[PDB]
């Protein structure tokens, strides 16, 4: 299948070179996989989700996304127009308030919730969790991420937007999960993207068009935007049977475009998420 005039990030992950505008992908499109978006919520009524999104848990007064961040990330995972895995099932877990903030205790609870909840869902091709959030180092937050991964969920997390070594941020610094940095449309490391030896992979993160609340769209930037590209790619690859939740991050790194990025500090991987599609 081919989506013409796609958002640049979708085109990038299906090409060996930058500057293309078509997103090439297998028609299976992540059908049968499930992705939990652990964030500010999801506006599940957005036409772009086609009835494939639903809120399953909130830690606040409402399950509504009053911010937009969660809806944007969910859109990059699996909306019709802006998504990597266009037929996946999306589950929203609201651990961040409508200002985009949340206590570590709540974020940890949300992770432990997903590890349990997945046992009540029909996700025959596998389960992914996308965490576009983080803050300063916490061994408890790292441990929760490690538990979620251990339970059989592919965990993708943002490296963070401090232009610093991700070793000092959580859950970015947990080695057992998939830590995602951001790149721009000219194959540069995004100027805000964290780096360091703990990064596993880069995905598109600057000027990413996706869904927004009020049934709208907008373009924003961050490692928060790169993370759902990788989460969506994982769901896509699991549906194709190419990899499993335990090994998806490694498989994605193994099959990545290598050496394409500029402004990568020595010691940081130069690997860009790639779906290896061949018609």
Strand partners, 178: 156
Smallest gap from residue 18 Cβ to Ca ion (A) = 8
Q: Is 16 annotated as a binding residue?
A: yes
Which residue from 232, 235, 256 is spatially nearest to 244, judged by alpha carbons?
235
Give the nearer residue to Ca ion in terms of CB position, either 96 or 155: 155
47 annotated binding-site participant: no
By beta-carbon proximity to Ca ion, the closer residue of 17 and 122 is 17
Catalytic hit among 46, 69, 72, 229: 69
The answer to whether residues 90 and 54 touch, using CB atoms and an 8 Å cutoff, is: yes
Catalytic residue among 39, 65, 98, 165: 39
Q: Is 96 exposed, middle or buried (0-12, 13-18, 19+ CB in 10 A)?
A: buried
Instruction: Characterise 68 by phi-psi region: left (phi > 0), alpha (psi -120 to 50), beta (else).
Output: left
Write the CB contacts of 124 (distance below 8 Å, at least 6 apart in sequence).
32
**Least distance from C-beta 123 to Ca ion, angstroms?**
23
Q: How far is it, in rounded angstroms, from Cα 200 to Cα 94? A: 26
The nearer residue to Ca ion, 173 or 224, going by C-beta atoms, is 173
CB of 276 to Ca ion, least distance (A): 12
Q: Is 184 annotated as a binding residue?
A: no
Contacts with Ca ion, residue ranges (CB under 5 A):
16-17, 175, 200, 257, 260
Which residue positions form the known binding site for Ca(2+)?
16, 175, 177, 200, 260
Which residue positions form the known binding site?
16, 175, 177, 200, 260
> Catalytic residues, which ones?
39, 69, 224
């Amino acid at each position: 299948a081919a989506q013409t005039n796609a958002p640049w990030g979708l085109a990038r992950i299906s090409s060996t070179s930058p500057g293309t505008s078509t997103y090439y992908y297998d028609e299976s499109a992540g059908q049968g996989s499930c992705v939990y978006v652990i964030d500010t919520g999801i506006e599940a009524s957005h036409p772009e989700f086609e009835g494939r999104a639903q809120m399953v848990k909130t830690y606040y007064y409402s399950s509504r996304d009053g911010n937009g961040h969660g809806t944007h990330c969910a859109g990059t995972v699996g909306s019709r127009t802006y998504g990597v895995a266009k037929k996946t099932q999306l589950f929203g877990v609201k651990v961040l308030d409508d200002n985009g903030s949340g206590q570590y205790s709540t974020i940890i609870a949300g992770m432990d919730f997903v590890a349990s909840d997945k046992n009540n869902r029909n996700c025959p091709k596998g389960v992914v969790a996308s965490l576009s959030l983080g803050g300063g180092y916490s061994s408890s937050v790292n441990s929760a991420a490690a538990r979620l991964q251990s339970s059989g969920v592919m965990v993708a997390v943002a490296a963070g937007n401090n232009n610093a070594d991700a070793r000092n941020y959580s859950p970015a610094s947990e080695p057992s999960v998939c830590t995602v940095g951001a790149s721009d449309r000219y194959d540069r490391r995004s100027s805000f993207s964290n780096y360091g030896s703990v990064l596993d992979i880069f995905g598109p993160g600057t000027d990413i068009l996706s869904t927004w609340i009020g049934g709208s769209t907008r373009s924003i930037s961050g490692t928060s935007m790169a993370t759902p590209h990788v989460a969506g790619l994982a769901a896509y690859l699991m549906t194709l049977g190419k990899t499993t939740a335990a090994s998806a991050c490694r498989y994605i790194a193994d099959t990545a475009n290598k050496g394409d990025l500029s402004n990568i500090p020595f010691g940081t991987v130069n690997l860009l998420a790639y779906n290896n599609y061949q018609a």
